[PDB]
Amino acid sequence: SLYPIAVLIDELRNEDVQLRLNSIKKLSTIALALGVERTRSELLPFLTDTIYDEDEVLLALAEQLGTFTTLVGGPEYVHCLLPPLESLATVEETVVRDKAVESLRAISHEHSPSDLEAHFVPLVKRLAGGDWFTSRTSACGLFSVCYPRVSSAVKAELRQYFRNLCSDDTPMVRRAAASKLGEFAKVLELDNVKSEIIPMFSNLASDEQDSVRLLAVEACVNIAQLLPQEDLEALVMPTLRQAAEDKSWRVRYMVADKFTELQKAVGPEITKTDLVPAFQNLMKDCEAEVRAAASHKVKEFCENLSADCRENVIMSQILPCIKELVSDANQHVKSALASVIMGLSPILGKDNTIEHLLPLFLAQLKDECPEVRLNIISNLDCVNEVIGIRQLSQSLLPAIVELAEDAKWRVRLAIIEYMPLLAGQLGVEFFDEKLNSLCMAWLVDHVYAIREAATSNLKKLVEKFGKEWAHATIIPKVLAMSGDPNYLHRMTTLFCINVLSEVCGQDITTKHMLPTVLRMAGDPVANVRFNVAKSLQKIGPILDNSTLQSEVKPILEKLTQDQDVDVKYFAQEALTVLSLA
């Protein structure tokens, strides 16, 4: 007892904190080795009376007590271990307060109901009566956890205590009270909330602090999801209205954020009544933040809106407002709306988009901003799916050539990914007339991602257009650029041959690409040497065994015999894959 206490104290007073952390980790072992009665009698009041300056070992002993409750003995002895937990809750650091209150969450979870009442309720009432706002925040979290197992009189007492700490003047306990009020109504009853909570909810909404309005309308969307429609329409509907048309753009931004959960809670009919006009007011507010938020949320608002008047309200109200935000010049809201309008385009369908959304789409594509351009080109695939290929290809063919060669490798990548559909739509002749040069420029482009994407793209073109046409046109291009001084373009040619050997049958591989690859096998650059080795590794199973054993084998044994360890290892790997020896 006394000697483990002595080694505990001489370990805890030191210079470093690692020994103190090890002391906290080993405290459970020391206490279990001592015994239950020993730790309850001596070690627990010791850890109450010790005041530590260092928050991490404070946090560690908080979670250590949370794990230590079973070694103390469980629900019979949680009353014994509660006073250290409350003395630990009354501190100055938010993170160790969070650890303390979650340890109390666990304690109240495993606590027996009668003992939980008879001891925990005086403890939480003392914590509420504590003068420190930290103690009030911890208490108001304990009010949220302490509801179900106590009797109805205790429920009423804790309810009026909660109302009192909500009526407390200092704002941080008001924020914590609004958070625990949002958490609190999950366990409360309908009559209880509509009698006590909703009036003090309206008081919190009528308060002056933007933060307490933030967490109060968080509690509002929580109680809106909890409550049925018929009473929230009577009570919290004007409160969320005045919160929405409140002056503070912070809460306007966040109710634009949580508007989708709000309309999900209230149902589509309430949206048809009044949520859409207030939504228009929010998105026509002068703030970039609320505009970005509403522009983000229009898609899920639309798809959570039922189809009885959906297209009607979109044509009459939503779409002129959307093109108004397009006319707005702010960069962020433009990019957000560019993503979300083609998110919601399949809801409108082919006819509505082809009447309205294609000119706006082409304007946003022919906008200067890289952000709107990258967004629109990254999720163009939605209007690809919902709009016919020929229609969109004809609508986009004026702007494809400029967008094909421009600033961002992202937009170039998306154009490369999407263009073979246009090539298959426009046939051999149009692609051969103007897109062939663009494909070659993409092959000789700067970025490696662009090069690999262009290689996959020409795979798609060769499998769409046939082997002999690519033999007529594409194969001379690659085999002619396979001699230039840049090893990067040599790597490009090797990747393209690795694809076109797989796709192009075997005869053109054996009589066209194979001599060029084996004549690039003697290049002085080691990088392209072992890349040719990897190329033969990829290409070998497509050949016949005669050609392999005739010409591939001397090249492979030379690429083993050469001095560099990397190309030698890769040649060994390719040789044992092809099993030529």
Binding site: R250, A288, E289, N330, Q331, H332, V333
Partner: peptide, 6 residues
Amino acid sequence: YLKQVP
């Protein structure tokens, strides 16, 4: 920077 994030 058109993002106040308050």
